[PDB]
Amino acid sequence: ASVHGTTYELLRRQGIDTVFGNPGSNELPFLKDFPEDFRYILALQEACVVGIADGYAQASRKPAFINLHSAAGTGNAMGALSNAWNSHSPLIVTAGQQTRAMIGVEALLTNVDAANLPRPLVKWSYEPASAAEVPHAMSRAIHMASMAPQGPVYLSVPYDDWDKDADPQSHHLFDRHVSSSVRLNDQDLDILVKALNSASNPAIVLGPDVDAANANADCVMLAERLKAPVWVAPSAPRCPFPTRHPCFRGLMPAGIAAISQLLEGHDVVLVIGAPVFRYHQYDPGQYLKPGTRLISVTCDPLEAFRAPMGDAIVADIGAMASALANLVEESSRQLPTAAPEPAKVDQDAGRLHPETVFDTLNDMAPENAIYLNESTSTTAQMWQRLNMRNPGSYYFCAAGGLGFALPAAIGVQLAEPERQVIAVIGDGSANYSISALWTAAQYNIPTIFVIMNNGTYGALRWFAGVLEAENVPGLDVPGIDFRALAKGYGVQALKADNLEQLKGSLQEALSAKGPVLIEVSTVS
Ligand X SMILES: Cc1ncc(C[n+]2csc(CCOP(=O)(O)OP(=O)(O)O)c2C)c(N)n1
Q: Which residues line the annotated binding site for Mg(2+)?
A: 116-117, 119
Query: Where are the extended beta strands (E) located within 247-348?
Result: 248-251, 268-272, 293-298, 311-314
- Which of 336, 381, 365 is CA-nearest to residue 448? 365
* Closest-approach residue to Ca ion (CB): 426
Shorter beta-carbon distance to ligand X: residue 282 or 418: 282
355 scored as a contact of Ca ion (CB under 5 A): no
Please count the residues of the chain.
524
Q: Residue 219 Cβ, how far from Na ion at the closest point, in Å?
A: 16
Residue 400 annotated in active site? yes
341 scored as a contact of Ca ion (CB under 5 A): no
Q: Which residues are annotated as a binding site?
A: 116-117, 119, 427, 454, 456
440 binds, among Na ion, its own copies, Ca ion, none (CB under 5 to 8 A by kind): none
SS3 435: helix
316 scored as a contact of Ca ion (CB under 5 A): no
Question: Alpha-carbon distance 415 to 396, whole Å?
Answer: 17
Q: Is the dihedral of CA 14, 177, 214, 80 positive or negative?
A: negative
What lies within 8 Å, CB to CB, of 307 at 6+ separation is 275, 276, 294, 296
Geometric angle at alpha carbon 12, from 7 and 16, rounded to 5°: 105
Shorter beta-carbon distance to its own copies: residue 119 or 333: 119
- Which of 93, 30, 95 is CA-nearest to residue 63? 93
SS3 30: helix
Residue 69 annotated in active site? yes
Q: Which residues are annotated as a binding site for Ca(2+)?
A: 427, 454, 456
Residue 46 annotated in active site? yes
Count the Cβ atoms, other than its own, within 10 Å of residue 242. Answer: 20
Question: Alpha-carbon distance 5 to 36, whole Å?
Answer: 13
Shorter beta-carbon distance to its own copies: residue 316 or 359: 316
400 scored as a contact of ligand X (CB under 6 A): yes
Do 331 and 204 form a contact (C-beta atoms < 8 A)? no
96 scored as a contact of ligand X (CB under 6 A): no
Shorter beta-carbon distance to ligand X: residue 49 or 192: 49
Residue 375 annotated in active site? no
Question: Alpha-carbon distance 406 to 383, whole Å?
Answer: 19
Site string for ligand X, 12-51 (x = CB under 6 A): ----------xxx---------------------------
378 binds, among ligand X, Ca ion, its own copies, none (CB under 5 to 8 A by kind): ligand X
Touching ligand X, residues 60-89 (CB under 6 A): 69, 72-73, 76, 79
Size, binding site for Na ion by CB under 5 A: 4
> Which of 5, 75, 310, 400 is an active site residue?
400
CA 256 to chain CA mean position, Å: 24
Touching ligand X, residues 436-455 (CB under 6 A): 454
Residue 458 annotated in active site? no
Rounded to the nearest 10 degrees, how much is the dihedral formed by the CA atoms of 464, 466, 470, 472? -10
185 scored as a contact of Na ion (CB under 5 A): yes
Shorter beta-carbon distance to Ca ion: residue 35 or 504: 504
172 binds, among Na ion, its own copies, Ca ion, none (CB under 5 to 8 A by kind): its own copies
Count the Cβ atoms, other than its own, within 10 Å of residue 266. Answer: 23
Q: Is the dihedral of CA 501, 502, 508, 513 positive or negative?
A: positive
401 scored as a contact of ligand X (CB under 6 A): yes
Strands 311-314 and 370-374: unpaired
Using CB under 5 A, pick the residue from 37, 175, 186, 468 that binds Na ion. Answer: 186
Residue 245 annotated in active site? no
Do 222 and 245 form a contact (C-beta atoms < 8 A)? no
Residue 27 annotated in active site? yes
> Which of 4, 9, 21, 46 is an active site residue?
46
Residues within the interface to Na ion (CB under 5 A):
185-186, 323, 346
Residues within the interface to ligand X (CB under 6 A):
22-24, 69, 72-73, 76, 79, 375-378, 400-403, 426-429, 432, 454, 456-460
Give the active site residues: 24-25, 27, 46, 69, 280, 400
